[PDB]
Each structure stands twice: as C-alpha cells, then as structure tokens.
C-alpha cells in the first residue's frame, strides 16, 4: 500500500546512491524538489582535449536530477534533455550540479540543472523533461 | 577520397579515444559530415529497470557526433545539444548511432544523430551543435 | 464512429487551411507523414534588423507540422520545440518548410522541420515533440 | 543606473517594434540581463481548442528574450532556442514573460524565459541562446 510506495521510494534512493557512489558524487544539500551534488573531475574522465567528457557531465546532471525527483517521492526518467556547454570541466575541477524542479504535471515534469566549477563559473546548463 | 580523409581522421581520433574503447564503440562507416558507430549494451550499463543508462546512450550519440563533425579535419566540440529518449536499450541490444551533417559553416555546425537497435527501432534522436576550436584534430 | 473520426480529420484540415490562408502559406507536396509548404516573407513580417521575425518562422513551421500530422489523421499539438536559426529570412525570400515525422508513439511523436530559402540554403531547423 | 540604461535601450527598441505593438505587448520591468513583458490573449489569437496559438506564445517569449539580451546596449539576436508548452493560454488570460540572463559572454549568451498567467500558473518555459551581431541596438 502506503508501505509499497514507501518501499519504492527507498528502493529508488538506494539505486540513485549506488550510481552516485560509482561516479564519485556527493550530496551537499537537498530538499523538496531540489538537490545540489558535487563531483571532482579525475584524469580518467578526460576526452582528447583534456576536458570532462560530455557523458560524464550528463551523468553528473542525471544523478542530481534523480535526487531532485526522489526528494519528493516522484521517481521519473528523462524523456528529453537540452544541454548548453559553456566552459569545459578540467581535471581537478570540483563541479557542483544543482537540480530544481520547474514544473511538475500529472505524468511529466521539467527540471533545470546547472553545473558550475569551484570558481562558481557555469560549466553547463540542462533542462530535462521527465516522465512519471 | 573525402571519405578516405574522413576515415584517416577517424582512425587518428579513435586510436586515442579511451571512452569509446571502454564502452566498446566501433566505427563502421565514415564520410565527410557522416559517421556510424556501434555498441552492444552489456549488463554493467543498466539502471533499475534493466535498461541502458542515459549517460551511456548520450555517450554513444556524442561519439558519432564527434566523428562526423571532426571528419573534415578541423577540430570541433559540442556547444549544445538535445536528446529525445524513445525506447529503452536492454542487455545484448546492438545499438547503431548515425550522425549526419545538416549545416556546416566555417565556424559552426549542426549534426543530427539517430540511435537504432538491432530490430531497426529508434532508441533516441539527438541534435548537436558544434563549434570549431582552431587547428586540426587530436 | 468511423464517421466521427472522419469528421475530426476534415475539421482539423479545415482549421489548418484557415491558418495557412491567413499566413499566406501554400501546400507544394504532401504525403504520408510529411508536408512541404511555402511562404513569401513580406515587409510586414520584418523585425528591426529587416528579417523575418522568429514568430512568423515558428508559425510557418507549426503549420507544416500540422499538415504532416493531418496527412495521416493524427491531429496533435506541440508540447516542446527546439529551433536553430542559421540565416535570416529577408523580405521577398520564398521560404519552404518541410515537415517529416521521425517517430510516432502511442500518445506522442517527434517531427523535424527544415525551412530553406529560394537558394536552397537553410534558414532554420526545428525538432518538435507532439502530443496526440 | 544599469537599470536606467536597460530601460533606455528598451524604450528605443520598443518605439519601433511593430510586432510587439500589434500583439499588445507592454514592457513592465527592465534591468541589465532582465525584462518582464505582458500581453493579454484576445480571441484573434486562438486555435481550434479556443487556446492561444504557439506562434503568439513563442512571440511573447522571444520579445522578453530580445529585451533582456539587448539591454546591455549590444545588438544581439537568437541563434537557437527551445520552448516547452505547459498549459493553454485562453481568451482574457493575462500572460507575463520574464526573461533572466544565465550566461552572457562577450559574444554569446543564454537567457531563460518563463511565461505565467494571471493565476500564477506556468504556461511555457523557453531557453534562448543569443549571439551579438556588432554595434549598438536598433
């Protein structure tokens, strides 16, 4: 019932935590409809121009997004995502991704995620459309 | 010709692409403004629904995109892009990403990528915008 | 029944035709899941830099899209749209918008629209996500 | 100060903006990187569901966007953008589009626009990318 819903919440949280662990992502701040997580770029994530590969950035943002869904028990997947890359993230940068619900409908939602560096400059903007 | 140059560029890039090699991406087709790459979904890449993670799918699309927009010999990177996820990728699924130039100016370009599984079903649609960053490729 | 569905088709077509009329849009070619329509930019559509305003371009593309939905009886609205503007459309250009279904799900779809000028250069690319 | 300059720019542009005037757009707030504009949905703008047309909604968002990204005094145009439609706009609805800078480099910028109706419900979310085209505004 209620207890199945609670179980699903806890299950979605365990899964999100396992991906975060495996990516080296830490929760810094989290509350209703938002989450701020951090990650350090390591030399293992560099593309040929020595910056963070777009797929790690996309995961870091996906994980922040999952945590923002999960702050309110609203487990969802992304159905679409738009991303502006403004500056590269280099090895050793500490990247902070904030995700924030902007609209939550009956079946779908829109979430914005901003990734910034340790100089507080914007590395990337995402807007995602979610489903569930 | 243009296709031979496109493949030389792609061989140069792939030879030091550890993300592509780590994910098992192979390149199967190359022409100027055009690339087709391939990857098998292994269990390691799955979320809680036994479905491929977005970042792996994004990475596949971004790889066909990097090849297609670097194929003319001018180093270029993504400034922006959009992805629609249409169907899950399940373990064992073989996924083919095809990237095709829609516009290429002196500095900027637009490239459409489609990811299709072995049943010929669309998994995902991506559209990427590139920016040349100066000089020749890595 | 069937005849209600047929009536709705014909009704959606009349509406799309009235918007096209009011925008000066002509059908050039149309078939299952695609439509190619044209429009001339008039001096009444210019912004301050003397090019077509983005909202006329958006309408021209919306109308091509409606006609592509309607080619197969699949009346829909756009829920999201992404647009790259590559070159302006100037007064007197004849702009051709092609719309093409790329995916059609149970409730939703994706359509691509390209607008080109009379020199066959690309003026704008749209990708739309549709609903119905 | 910065806001006074922002409003001078906006008065200069609006004074010859016939699309804004034709659609009844008014400007109500201006600061550097920031603009709020307003419009009432009349019957003339409705589709077959008695709902505002996308192009009118797009035009409203693009107007707040043009104001916000021209507010620093450097002529700039949209190179790309994306819109999510969330709720219909019905006749009589008063719609407010607020545009806020997320990034502004020397040449390019990103601006987020939200359209809200008189019940404070979101109608639409738009994100636009701008490109400066040289010199001062029209």
From Swiss-Prot, chains A, C:
Q: MF terms per GO, please?
A: acyl-CoA hydrolase activity
For the protein in the UniProt heading, the enzyme class is: hydrolase
Q: Which UniProt keywords apply?
A: Hydrolase
Biological-process GO terms, alphabetical: phenylacetate catabolic process
Its EC number(s): 3.1.2.-
Q: Spell out the SUPFAM superfamilies in the cross-references.
A: Thioesterase/thiol ester dehydrase-isomerase (SSF54637)
Q: What induces it?
A: Activated by cAMP receptor protein (CRP), integration host factor (IHF) and by phenylacetyl-coenzyme A (PA-CoA) that prevents PaaX from binding its target sequences. Inhibited by PaaX.
> Which pathway does the record list?
Aromatic compound metabolism; phenylacetate degradation
Has the keyword Amino-acid biosynthesis been applied to this entry?
A: no
Instruction: Give the pH-dependence text from the record.
Output: Optimum pH is 7.5-9.
Q: Which Gene3D superfamilies match?
A: Hotdog Thioesterase
Q: How does this chain assemble?
A: Homotetramer.
The family assignment reads: Belongs to the thioesterase PaaI family.
Please give the function described in this protein's UniProt entry.
Thioesterase with a preference for ring-hydroxylated phenylacetyl-CoA esters. Hydrolyzes 3,4-dihydroxyphenylacetyl-CoA, 3-hydroxyphenylacetyl-CoA and 4-hydroxyphenylacetyl-CoA. Inactive towards 4-hydroxybenzoyl-CoA and 4-hydroxyphenacyl-CoA.
- The identity of this protein, by name, is Acyl-coenzyme A thioesterase PaaI
Task: Give the gene name.
Answer: paaI
Curated annotation (Swiss-Prot), chains B, D:
Which residue windows are coiled coil?
none
The impact of changing residue 47 to A is: Reduces activity 1000-fold
Ordered alphabetically, the record's keywords are: Hydrolase
Q: Output the Gene3D superfamilies linked to this UniProt entry.
A: Hotdog Thioesterase
Give disulfide pairs as residue numbers.
Answer: none
- A GO MF label: acyl-CoA hydrolase activity
Q: What class of enzyme is it?
A: hydrolase
What Enzyme Commission number(s) appear in the record?
Answer: 3.1.2.-
Cite a single GO BP annotation: phenylacetate catabolic process
Q: In which pathway does it act?
A: Aromatic compound metabolism; phenylacetate degradation
> What factors induce this protein?
Activated by cAMP receptor protein (CRP), integration host factor (IHF) and by phenylacetyl-coenzyme A (PA-CoA) that prevents PaaX from binding its target sequences. Inhibited by PaaX.
Q: How does activity depend on pH?
A: Optimum pH is 7.5-9.
The subunit field of the Swiss-Prot or TrEMBL record says:
Homotetramer.
As for family, the record states: Belongs to the thioesterase PaaI family.
The record's PANTHER family line, in alphabetical order, gives: ACYL-COENZYME A THIOESTERASE PAAI
Functionally, this protein is described as follows:
Thioesterase with a preference for ring-hydroxylated phenylacetyl-CoA esters. Hydrolyzes 3,4-dihydroxyphenylacetyl-CoA, 3-hydroxyphenylacetyl-CoA and 4-hydroxyphenylacetyl-CoA. Inactive towards 4-hydroxybenzoyl-CoA and 4-hydroxyphenacyl-CoA.
- In Swiss-Prot or TrEMBL terms, this protein is called Acyl-coenzyme A thioesterase PaaI
Its taxonomic path starts at:
Bacteria, Pseudomonadati, Pseudomonadota, Gammaproteobacteria, Enterobacterales
Gene from which the chain derives: paaI
């Amino acid at each position: 019932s209620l207890s199945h819903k609670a179980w699903q919440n806890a299950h979605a949280m365990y899964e999100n935590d396992a991906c975060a662990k495996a990516l080296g992502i830490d929760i810094i701040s989290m509350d209703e409809g938002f989450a701020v997580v951090t990650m350090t770029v390591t030399a293992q994530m560099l593309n040929g121009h020595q910056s963070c590969h777009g797929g790690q950035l996309f995961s870091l943002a996906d994980t922040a997004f999952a945590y923002a869904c999960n702050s309110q028990g609203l487990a969802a997947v992304a159905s679409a995502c738009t991303i502006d890359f403004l500056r590269p993230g280099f090895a050793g940068d500490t990247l902070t991704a904030t995700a924030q619900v902007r609209h939550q409908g009956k079946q779908t939602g829109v979430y914005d995620i901003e990734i910034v560096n340790q100089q507080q400059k914007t590395v990337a903007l995402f807007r995602g459309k979610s489903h569930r």
